[PDB]
Nucleic acid binder design. Structure first.
Ligand SMILES: Nc1ccn([C@H]2CC[C@@H](COP(=O)(O)OP(=O)(O)OP(=O)(O)O)O2)c(=O)n1
Ligand SMILES: [Ca+2]
Length: 341
DNA sequence: GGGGGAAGGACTG
DNA sequence: TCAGTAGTCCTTCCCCC
């Protein structure tokens, strides 16, 4: 099994670079401005010129501005990046019938039936980087290995504008050396739960009784790491089917006044319905992020498709429910729709 | 025991 | 006033068989 993983480099910012060439070379910081105060908000993606100085996704806009005060700060333009992404994904479709779009900038290709070895597999990923570059002027990084996970890990090592193959040999090496925290799907939370169990490398999962692990991080993540450690991971490339579509927003100020929150909720509904396009959801979920950044939610599943009007009146009921059951003020409010007809 | 949902959680990053 | 968005998978808890 030969998996070829494609990951677009600092995508949001790179697109801005393509639509405005005079930006390349200089630090570009694509941000999400909340409007709670000057430059309130967060960095969503920065290019390499910026990242080399510590300005990257997640940090506060105001912090970025302290480090790189003369960088070009741009507001997020999601729809624009989504259309560019659609065209590039279509380019990838032309190299394999088995494709798995994982996000707006990541796709796995099962080229097991397209190449004989990693040499051909390397040349194909070479052809792809040149195809995308030719038509969209977007650089991407290619990862190649025996399974999706290691294909991705490869791409993370080669970034940016890179390409790398991790053969059966290197896989065994990584299983022993690789900091398990660098394994896709393992965040800070799960990593710490591991150090405390004396597991810092994929291999270390083979030296501890299953239940001890399956009891610390859960059965799924257990069977996941173990399978990777034993070099038995082989999840197939599955054609992605969007299962949910939503929208969440930050309010100018925290609140718990149903009438002050409503405008933000309805806006989220309108945007969600525009993005549902033809898809009829049967389940709605209202999601609130409280003042202390905790996450709270209430949803409902109807035995029929949810019209916009039902969305409006039902979301209000779900928001009221949250307010009654939780006394904290809300900071972000949004809605997610799922279970499509 | 485990299905099915809801809600929470984690990671996507 | 440092803390954005989007989507998936998983777990927990409960109902229920
Ligand atoms: N706190 C974070 C961390 C990451 N991301 C998103 C946007 C950038 C991306 C980084 O993940 P990679 O797959 O490594 O991509 P990249 O080439 O490093 O960056 P980009 O996604 O911008 O191309 O994920 C985010 O929104 N918020
Ligand atoms: Ca990327």
């Amino acid at each position: 099994m030969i998996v070829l993983f494609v990951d677009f480099d600092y995508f949001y910012a790179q697109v801005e670079e393509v639509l405005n060439p005079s930006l390349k070379g200089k630090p570009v910081v694509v941000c999400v401005f909340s409007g709670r105060f000057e430059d309130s908000g967060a960095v969503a993606t920065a290019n390499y010129e910026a990242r080399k100085f510590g300005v990257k996704a997640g940090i506060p806009i105001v912090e970025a501005k302290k480090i790189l005060p003369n960088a070009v700060y741009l507001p997020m333009r999601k729809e624009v990046y989504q259309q560019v992404s659609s065209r590039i994904m279509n380019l990838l479709r032309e190299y394999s019938e088995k494709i798995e779009i994982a996000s707006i900038d990541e796709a796995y290709l099962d080229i097991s039936d397209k190449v004989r070895d990693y040499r051909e597999a390397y040349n194909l990923g070479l052809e792809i980087k040149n195809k995308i570059l030719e038509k969209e002027k977007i650089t991407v990084t290619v990862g190649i290995s025996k399974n999706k996970v290691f294909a991705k890990i490869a791409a993370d090592m080669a970034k940016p504008n890179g390409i790398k193959v991790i053969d059966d040999e290197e896989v065994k090496r990584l299983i022993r050396e690789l900091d398990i925290a660098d394994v896709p799907g393992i965040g800070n939370i799960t990593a710490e739960k591991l150090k405390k169990l004396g597991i810092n490398k994929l291999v270390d999962t083979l030296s501890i009784e299953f239940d001890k692990l399956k009891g610390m991080i859960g059965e799924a993540k257990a069977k996941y790491l173990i399978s990777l450690a034993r070099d038995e991971y082989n999840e197939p490339i599955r054609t992605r089917v969007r299962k949910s579509i939503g929208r969440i927003v930050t309010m100018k100020r925290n609140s718990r006044n149903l009438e002050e929150i409503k405008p933000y909720l309805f806006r989220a509904i309108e945007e969600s319905y525009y993005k549902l396009d033809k898809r009829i959801p049967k389940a709605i979920h209202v999601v609130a992020v409280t003042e202390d950044l905790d996450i709270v939610s209430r949803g409902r599943t109807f035995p029929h498709g949810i019209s916009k009007e039902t969305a409006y009146s039902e979301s209000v009921k779900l928001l009221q429910k949250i307010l009654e059951e939780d006394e904290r003020k809300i900071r972000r409010i949004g809605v997610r729709f799922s279970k499509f007809i």
